[PDB]
């Protein structure tokens, strides 16, 4: 099947200023995300080579390379369209109602998501996801790209808390980055994903 | 929405002998899985309490408790019907063809899955999953319940490599447990999940 | 440098009964610890080969194999002499006084240590250690063998909470294993370790 | 016991230019290291409170906060004096001879160390350490601050590969940061640490 590819940004590289700089968007998308695409394709290619030669002695390496890079690729693929120069404000419609039901209010959702974002020790993400078993909205606090999450959980809104996502602009003051993020959230994009996710069940 | 519950086993507790003992099935399902159900419901209840009282200072604890227990619950929910007293043999139909295409052959799939299973350092799982971004079959080697995996990946076939899943019968000789597992795989169940998973895309 | 070797047990397999079975002690020492010794020697051999042949692209694998196996070897090397058929009771002398100072009382230390032991999510350890920077006693809750700890911290008392350490005897009821453990702690060994540790500083 | 404190830098912020910028050194030491000092003291205070008030159900959180922050404090405490404006060149004397014996040559040590540094998937460190069991030099590739290492191993030379350590200057090009690092290694400091380490045994 077709290899992974780097998706293009769906807005100008400087479209998210003054909240996320064009300097960051260029490095983050063009360099960091590109590396995951290559790493994910390479992990699959190397696993196919291992199977074909009958030597799976490096399986642990290949499986971590696969998880790390595929997770990085999935996470950034969702992240870019989650942002918009026409973003901000609050979720509406069925997504807004579901957030009120799952978290109490938009304010409480935001406070929980923000606390999950700033609490990470090392690299990671705060995400809103749909649990396909319970058929419900949850927040997950990812470690690196591929840890601290349940299988099947379907990503809806991502916030990258790796230092490369904010350091050039905000230095160590990551809370100011988290606050800025709310200005650029593309709730229409999150709503489309929610429509897709709600059709998925574990079985 | 409705709380998580413990699913019943879909066969007799001793149905998988001599491959997995009834002694293990009873403890593993009735005690271990029950604990994840309670832990997952409790994590959500405690997160709701934290939001309502405006104190998210324990978010890191609650988010790991959620990930660990929800992942445990998802993983075992898929695991039980993945096994059957009428299991064994090989995948057929579109699932069999997809495994041949993704892994080269059933033998190569089995060798890769087995190597992933025995290579774990600590607790974990070998799983066959559908990557919802690439629309393709992959193996993932999970750490504990909730690590070393990509968001969205949809579980199809699980092998629990926590020591509680095999120690009473096989002691330290986990390779013999992995070999025994192939005798009880419910390929019809895996095929149904694959039919469900193939309808899911990241977007 | 000389290869790592498996230390002998300082007592007969059954010497810790009824608290820890001879059945477990034999498997645990003769099979599990032996595998970490081999794994640690193999990791060093493979690192030397990778340096010599130019294969340091495998470094992440080889360094995880080294950490996991060397940590397992270290941890079990401390564990066996930490137990004794003539143990139990309480720490005395300077060790007893330091535990009182650091934790409040022996009973409070036991409550904290026991909570760290039973709380592990996955495989791990509860340990008492000397922090060589702060020159003070701490508990550390290790993940697997090699996670959740500070460099230099010097192990004094170990409790193995991997399921292989207790499952055959206590099944899922790890609190009963932890309760049993206190009857076999070799406080004289812990005290010797403490004397050695207090001479170590980070500098 | 006395609370942890932030050690002063042994040189001016800009003393490592052009290899590591004063801009980074100031943020890194004055903001990031300060936070680990506070976090480590806070973790110990919160553990004492949990013991006293009966709240050890929070033990997993408090022990992760302790490990993460104490490890960060340890690691940076070693890092600053490991660097010098009068460094670079090569290890000599007994340290140089031991590196030749353990790694083949200084050049082979540098290749291994550099591969461990650039290979990290997430935040972490490459370190040279003394294994207090085997009485030998090893490299360890730390995850975050507190992962992928063996208890007791005594740190000699640290390279911080968290993105905050290099991003403002080197952006995503971490190989150029690692190349730069060799020009500022304080081999006299590493040699002192090695003298101290060789007197430590696991026992
Ligand atoms: Fe990123
Ligand atoms: Fe299980
Ligand atoms: Fe063990
Ligand atoms: Fe740092």
mmCIF file of N, CA, C and O and ligand atoms in Angstrom, chain D residues 28 32-33 36 72 76 79-80 125 145 160-162 164-165, ligand 4:
data_model
loop_
_atom_site.group_PDB
_atom_site.id
_atom_site.type_symbol
_atom_site.label_atom_id
_atom_site.label_comp_id
_atom_site.label_asym_id
_atom_site.label_seq_id
_atom_site.Cartn_x
_atom_site.Cartn_y
_atom_site.Cartn_z
ATOM 1 N N UNK D 28 18.652 28.021 30.754
ATOM 2 C CA UNK D 28 18.777 26.625 31.124
ATOM 3 C C UNK D 28 19.080 26.476 32.611
ATOM 4 O O UNK D 28 18.445 25.686 33.322
ATOM 5 N N UNK D 32 15.331 26.540 34.111
ATOM 6 C CA UNK D 32 15.007 25.112 34.088
ATOM 7 C C UNK D 32 15.559 24.390 35.319
ATOM 8 O O UNK D 32 14.847 23.627 35.981
ATOM 9 N N UNK D 33 16.835 24.594 35.643
ATOM 10 C CA UNK D 33 17.381 23.870 36.792
ATOM 11 C C UNK D 33 16.706 24.326 38.079
ATOM 12 O O UNK D 33 16.348 23.495 38.927
ATOM 13 N N UNK D 36 13.639 22.237 38.803
ATOM 14 C CA UNK D 36 13.843 20.893 39.347
ATOM 15 C C UNK D 36 14.172 20.941 40.829
ATOM 16 O O UNK D 36 13.743 20.073 41.591
ATOM 17 N N UNK D 72 16.393 15.326 37.471
ATOM 18 C CA UNK D 72 16.759 16.542 36.757
ATOM 19 C C UNK D 72 17.796 17.344 37.515
ATOM 20 O O UNK D 72 18.741 17.872 36.927
ATOM 21 N N UNK D 76 21.650 17.922 36.030
ATOM 22 C CA UNK D 76 22.172 19.252 35.729
ATOM 23 C C UNK D 76 23.296 19.638 36.688
ATOM 24 O O UNK D 76 24.218 20.373 36.304
ATOM 25 N N UNK D 79 26.134 18.258 34.999
ATOM 26 C CA UNK D 79 26.325 18.870 33.683
ATOM 27 C C UNK D 79 27.155 20.157 33.741
ATOM 28 O O UNK D 79 28.098 20.324 32.959
ATOM 29 N N UNK D 80 26.823 21.103 34.636
ATOM 30 C CA UNK D 80 27.506 22.397 34.554
ATOM 31 C C UNK D 80 29.019 22.275 34.712
ATOM 32 O O UNK D 80 29.746 22.834 33.878
ATOM 33 N N UNK D 125 19.260 12.172 27.673
ATOM 34 C CA UNK D 125 20.673 12.462 27.867
ATOM 35 C C UNK D 125 21.515 11.329 27.306
ATOM 36 O O UNK D 125 21.081 10.173 27.284
ATOM 37 N N UNK D 145 14.695 12.435 32.448
ATOM 38 C CA UNK D 145 15.831 12.484 33.357
ATOM 39 C C UNK D 145 16.111 11.174 34.066
ATOM 40 O O UNK D 145 17.235 10.961 34.513
ATOM 41 N N UNK D 160 23.122 16.910 27.859
ATOM 42 C CA UNK D 160 21.681 17.145 27.879
ATOM 43 C C UNK D 160 21.161 17.266 26.461
ATOM 44 O O UNK D 160 21.561 18.177 25.733
ATOM 45 N N UNK D 161 20.269 16.359 26.072
ATOM 46 C CA UNK D 161 19.660 16.339 24.755
ATOM 47 C C UNK D 161 18.196 16.737 24.778
ATOM 48 O O UNK D 161 17.500 16.546 23.783
ATOM 49 N N UNK D 162 17.715 17.309 25.874
ATOM 50 C CA UNK D 162 16.430 17.978 25.814
ATOM 51 C C UNK D 162 16.525 19.136 24.833
ATOM 52 O O UNK D 162 17.564 19.796 24.711
ATOM 53 N N UNK D 164 15.419 22.094 24.965
ATOM 54 C CA UNK D 164 15.783 23.389 25.537
ATOM 55 C C UNK D 164 17.286 23.580 25.628
ATOM 56 O O UNK D 164 17.746 24.721 25.752
ATOM 57 N N UNK D 165 18.069 22.504 25.582
ATOM 58 C CA UNK D 165 19.510 22.632 25.724
ATOM 59 C C UNK D 165 20.173 23.142 24.457
ATOM 60 O O UNK D 165 21.331 23.588 24.509
HETATM 61 FE FE1 LIG E 4 18.232 20.550 30.706
#
